[PDB]
C-alpha cells in the first residue's frame, strides 16, 4: 500500500 498525491490524496494497496 502507498499514499498517492493527485492533490487530494489516495491510499492504494
Amino acid at each position: 500500500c502507498q499514499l498517492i498525491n493527485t492533490n487530494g490524496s489516495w491510499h492504494i494497496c
Partner: antibody, heavy 119, light 112 residues
Framework: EVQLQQPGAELVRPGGSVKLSCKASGYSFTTYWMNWVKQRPGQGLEWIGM????????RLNQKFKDKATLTLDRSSSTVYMQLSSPTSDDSAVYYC????????????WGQGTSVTVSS | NIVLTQSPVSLAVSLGQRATISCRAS??????????MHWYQQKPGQPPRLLLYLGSNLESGVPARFSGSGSGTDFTLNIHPVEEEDAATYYC?????????FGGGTKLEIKR
C-alpha cells in the same frame, strides 16, 4: 438526485465583472471537489481549477492565475468563479462539475453558463 | 503540464463496425494499482458525460458496449457494436496531478 444549478448565460461589459454560480443539491455540500471547465463552442475542454467544499482548499490552473477566483457560500450550497477583466477571449461556456469520488473523475455536470463579453 | 494527445482527430465507422480511440500522456498517469485517466462523451449543446474512469471502470448506466484499457502513458477507448447514439466527440482526461488536462477530442461520425 445530484444536481448542479448554473444560469443559462451571462452578458458582461468588457472590463466589467462577472461571478458565475453553481448551486449544488442532492448531497452533503461538504464532500468531494467542485471543478470549473472552460469551452468555446465547437472547441475542446480546458480545466480552470477546483475547490474542496469541506475546507475551501483550492487548486488553480496557473494559466488562469490572474483571471479566475474560486470561492463558495456554504449556506447557499453554492460554488463561485469570478473572472477578472473580462475580454472577448473569456466568452465561452463554463461548466461546473463534481468529482464522483475524491478529487478524480467528473461524474456530475452543470448545464454550463455561456458568458458573452460584449458592450 | 501533462499534454494529452489523442488520435485520430476524427473517424467514420459503419453501423456495426469498430471505433478505437487513442490517448497518449506526456508522462505516466499511473501510480500504485491506479491509472488516473478518464473518458468523456459530448454531443452538441450538452455537457460532457463521464463514460470511463480509472482507465477501465464503466460509470453506472453506461452501456457495456464501451470499454477502456491502458497503462502509464497509453490509453485506448473501444466501442463494442457502434450504435447511432455514439455520434459524439470523445475526450480523455487525467486526474494524476494539478492542472487536469483534457485530450483534444475525437469526433466519431457514423457511416450510413
Amino acid at each position: 438526485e445530484v444536481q448542479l444549478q448554473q444560469p443559462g448565460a451571462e452578458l458582461v461589459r468588457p472590463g466589467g465583472s462577472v461571478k458565475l454560480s453553481c448551486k449544488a443539491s442532492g448531497y452533503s455540500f461538504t464532500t468531494y471537489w467542485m471543478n470549473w471547465v472552460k469551452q468555446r463552442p465547437g472547441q475542446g475542454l480546458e480545466w480552470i481549477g477546483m475547490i474542496q467544499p469541506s475546507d475551501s482548499e483550492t487548486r488553480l490552473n496557473q494559466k488562469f492565475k490572474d483571471k479566475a477566483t474560486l470561492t463558495l457560500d456554504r449556506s447557499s450550497s453554492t460554488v463561485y468563479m469570478q473572472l477578472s477583466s473580462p475580454t472577448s477571449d473569456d466568452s465561452a461556456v463554463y461548466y461546473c462539475a463534481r468529482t464522483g469520488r475524491g478529487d478524480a473523475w467528473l461524474t456530475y455536470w452543470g448545464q454550463g453558463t455561456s458568458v458573452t463579453v460584449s458592450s | 503540464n501533462i499534454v494529452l494527445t489523442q488520435s485520430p482527430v476524427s473517424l467514420a465507422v459503419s453501423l456495426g463496425q469498430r471505433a478505437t480511440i487513442s490517448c497518449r500522456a506526456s508522462k505516466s498517469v499511473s501510480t500504485s494499482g491506479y491509472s488516473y485517466m478518464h473518458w468523456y462523451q459530448q454531443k452538441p449543446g450538452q455537457p460532457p458525460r463521464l463514460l470511463l474512469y480509472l482507465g477501465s471502470n464503466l460509470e453506472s448506466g453506461v452501456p457495456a458496449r464501451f470499454s477502456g484499457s491502458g497503462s502509464g502513458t497509453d490509453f485506448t477507448l473501444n466501442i463494442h457494436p457502434v450504435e447511432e447514439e455514439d455520434a459524439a466527440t470523445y475526450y480523455c482526461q487525467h486526474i494524476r496531478e494539478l492542472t487536469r488536462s483534457f485530450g483534444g477530442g475525437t469526433k466519431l461520425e457514423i457511416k450510413r
